Amino acid sequence: HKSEVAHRFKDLGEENFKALVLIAFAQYLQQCPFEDHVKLVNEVTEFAKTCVADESAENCDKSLHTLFGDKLCTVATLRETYGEMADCCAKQEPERNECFLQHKDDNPNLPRLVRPEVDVMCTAFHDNEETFLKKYLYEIARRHPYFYAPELLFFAKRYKAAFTECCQAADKAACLLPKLDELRDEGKASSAKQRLKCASLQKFGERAFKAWAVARLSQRFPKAEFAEVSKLVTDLTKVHTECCHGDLLECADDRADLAKYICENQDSISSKLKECCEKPLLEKSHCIAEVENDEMPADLPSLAADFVESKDVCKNYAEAKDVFLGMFLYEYARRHPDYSVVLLLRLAKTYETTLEKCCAAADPHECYAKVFDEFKPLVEEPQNLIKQNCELFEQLGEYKFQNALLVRYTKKVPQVSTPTLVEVSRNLGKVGSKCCKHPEAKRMPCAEDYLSVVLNQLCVLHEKTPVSDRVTKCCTESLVNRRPCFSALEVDETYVPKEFNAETFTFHADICTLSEKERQIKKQTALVELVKHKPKATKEQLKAVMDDFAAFVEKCCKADDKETCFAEEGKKLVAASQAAL
Numbered sequence: 001h002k003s004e005v006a007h008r009f010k011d012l013g014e015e016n017f018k019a020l021v022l023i024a025f026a027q028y029l030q031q032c033p034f035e036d037h038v039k040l041v042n043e044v045t046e047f048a049k050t051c052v053a054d055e056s057a058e059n060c061d062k063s064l065h066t067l068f069g070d071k072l073c074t075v076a077t078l079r080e081t082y083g084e085m086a087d088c089c090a091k092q093e094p095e096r097n098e099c100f101l102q103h104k105d106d107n108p109n110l111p112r113l114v115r116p117e118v119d120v121m122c123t124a125f126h127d128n129e130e131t132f133l134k135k136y137l138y139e140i141a142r143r144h145p146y147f148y149a150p151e152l153l154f155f156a157k158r159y160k161a162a163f164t165e166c167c168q169a170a171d172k173a174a175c176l177l178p179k180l181d182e183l184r185d186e187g188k189a190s191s192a193k194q195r196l197k198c199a200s201l202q203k204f205g206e207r208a209f210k211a212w213a214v215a216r217l218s219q220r221f222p223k224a225e226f227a228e229v230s231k232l233v234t235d236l237t238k239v240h241t242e243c244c245h246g247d248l249l250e251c252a253d254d255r256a257d258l259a260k261y262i263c264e265n266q267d268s269i270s271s272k273l274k275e276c277c278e279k280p281l282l283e284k285s286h287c288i289a290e291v292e293n294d295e296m297p298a299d300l301p302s303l304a305a306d307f308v309e310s311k312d313v314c315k316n317y318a319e320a321k322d323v324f325l326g327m328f329l330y331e332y333a334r335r336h337p338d339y340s341v342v343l344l345l346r347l348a349k350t351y352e353t354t355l356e357k358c359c360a361a362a363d364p365h366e367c368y369a370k371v372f373d374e375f376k377p378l379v380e381e382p383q384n385l386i387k388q389n390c391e392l393f394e395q396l397g398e399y400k401f402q403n404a405l406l407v408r409y410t411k412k413v414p415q416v417s418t419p420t421l422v423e424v425s426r427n428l429g430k431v432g433s434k435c436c437k438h439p440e441a442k443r444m445p446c447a448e449d450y451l452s453v454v455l456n457q458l459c460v461l462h463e464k465t466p467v468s469d470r471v472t473k474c475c476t477e478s479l480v481n482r483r484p485c486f487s488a489l490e491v492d493e494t495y496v497p498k499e500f501n502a503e504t505f506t507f508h509a510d511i512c513t514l515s516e517k518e519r520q521i522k523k524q525t526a527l528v529e530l531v532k533h534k535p536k537a538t539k540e541q542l543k544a545v546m547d548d549f550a551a552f553v554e555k556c557c558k559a560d561d562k563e564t565c566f567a568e569e570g571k572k573l574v575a576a577s578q579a580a581l
């Protein structure tokens, strides 16, 4: 096509084009005001319309990379505001585009966004909806400059739907606030997930990424042949490498080309792609990544024929070790969508270690005859953990389950800050809430999706502020051994009980006026501090103190005089608690 800008406008549509141009500029000019960005979008949009009317109009034949760079270099305050970045304007393309990619700021030093009152939000949405939504699209994009632009737009459309339905309801807040809390949690997870994959591609390697992909794609597309899975995996690895380099237009085109191939080869891939493949180009790649797993071929044979019995195991392996191990992973994963990818990789590393030892031993066939038995323990450990934890959750409920986790983790690593302990424990209790609702066959995959991001954030915080070598060890082990390591941590036998401090256990009536959330965190912060002072306390002993405290609040929160109840009846609860322990 002669005009890329015209081709994108016609393909995306005016509304979507204007929103993506706003996000693109906001992620590079993170310190320019919203009104400045609106003017840029309108200037690029009117030029695009000139090219849609006549593709041979001036500058309509230029690259979108050249047009983006030219506009960035027209900003008059560029040097004074961004310094080094302005020096990219002295370079020619393609060196200027690479220079801009290298000078984007990951940490904008900006104040946190404060959720306004519902009525203020709903009044703003009504009087000027586009302004309200684009202002917040700008605020988020400047704060998250590496978040894939098309996905941020998909979240904005979700936010629009929440405000449209809730701002005209009877209890707006009861409708909207639970939705904004869900969208925020989903957005933070996607950001962390996007950055984690790129950091993994560099730390663990391309071979490692490809094993992960073979396993996941064989679970989603079980009827596809190994060679189609191997093709999609080779292509998916190229898209991830480009996307992780940072260029949005290059990432979007690679992703779209792969979507086009998948949709032109559905009969050779999956029966669940019909609707994703009818959707517009902007949403096709996203839809495919969320597609449900296809049913597997009804009768599939045992894996022992080709992987244990056949006399040609060591021969087929030596011919191409990674192809053979990939075929094993493909065959095991297609049959086990109920497993985590990391479990399937543990089973693959066990077969590889076994073949490496037995294929060079006096008698190989006998040496590896019982390999499938080495897989049973690896499968039951994660399976039992899921059942045990999902059972304890059902008997307790989210908050109490979170509190059961709090005591467990505080005793395992008591050096961790009380705030870090409370958040991690609350987050993990949420994974259990959501995943334990899914059925047994989707629980382990659910847990992996969320634990991957919960644990890496924990390991990121620990790198910055290290406190335990045992956490460092688990955080610096093979990613296949990360969760098993954390789960194997035992109660710290070396920790010295923290010294008592009355204030930490001093409570006021301000608690009765707090939200459920703020009140839960206050109590949980105190439970952490209790276990830190009395780490040898038994579950019978702690339940007693917790039962006594609970009875204290309800009472002093119901007493004609409260400020005194909390003070007097609180000096007794503490002294009796100290004695029981």
Ligand SMILES: O=C(O)[C@](F)(OC(F)(F)C(F)(F)C(F)(F)F)C(F)(F)F
Pocket (backbone or CB within 6 Å): 340, 341, 342, 343, 381, 382, 383, 385, 386, 389, 444, 445, 446, 447, 448, 449, 451, 483, 484
């Ligand atoms: O396979 C793993 O090791 C895994 F990471 O954890 C786990 F199995 F889900 C688990 F063990 F944490 C539990 F408790 F949730 F089962 C997951 F999530 F990848 F499966």
Ligand SMILES: O=C(O)[C@](F)(OC(F)(F)C(F)(F)C(F)(F)F)C(F)(F)F
Pocket (backbone or CB within 6 Å): 385, 386, 389, 390, 405, 428, 429, 431, 432, 447, 451, 483, 486, 487
């Ligand atoms: O695996 C564990 O021991 C772990 F505690 O997670 C967990 F137990 F699986 C869980 F409780 F978070 C749940 F809900 F997923 F089951 C942790 F911290 F190691 F990941």
Ligand SMILES: CCCCCCCCCCCCCC(=O)O
Pocket (backbone or CB within 6 Å): 113, 114, 115, 116, 132, 133, 134, 136, 137, 140, 152, 155, 156, 159, 160, 180, 181, 184
């Ligand atoms: C990501 C695109 C968002 C555009 C619309 C956002 C509207 C919600 C504003 C209030 C949310 C503030 C952040 C929060 O939920 O804590």
Ligand SMILES: CCCCCCCCCCCCCC(=O)O
Pocket (backbone or CB within 6 Å): 207, 208, 210, 211, 214, 230, 233, 234, 322, 323, 325, 326, 345, 348, 349, 352, 480
């Ligand atoms: C695309 C087909 C072959 C490419 C990838 C197959 C590699 C086999 C993985 C065996 C090692 C698993 C452990 C790991 O890398 O994390």
Ligand SMILES: CCCCCCCCCCCCCC(=O)O
Pocket (backbone or CB within 6 Å): 008, 020, 021, 024, 044, 064, 067, 068, 149, 150, 249, 251, 252, 253, 255, 256, 259, 281, 282, 283, 284, 285, 286
């Ligand atoms: C000059 C500003 C250019 C901004 C245009 C950005 C276009 C990105 C949208 C590409 C469509 C998404 C493709 C995909 O992810 O499958």
Ligand SMILES: CCCCCCCCCCCCCC(=O)O
Pocket (backbone or CB within 6 Å): 505, 523, 524, 526, 527, 530, 533, 545, 546, 547, 549, 550, 573, 574, 577, 578
């Ligand atoms: C060493 C003296 C400790 C003071 C006693 C108060 C400790 C209770 C804090 C945790 C309460 C648990 C909350 C709950 O069960 O709902």
Ligand SMILES: [Br-]
Pocket (backbone or CB within 6 Å): 416, 417, 420, 465, 467
């Ligand atoms: Br910490």
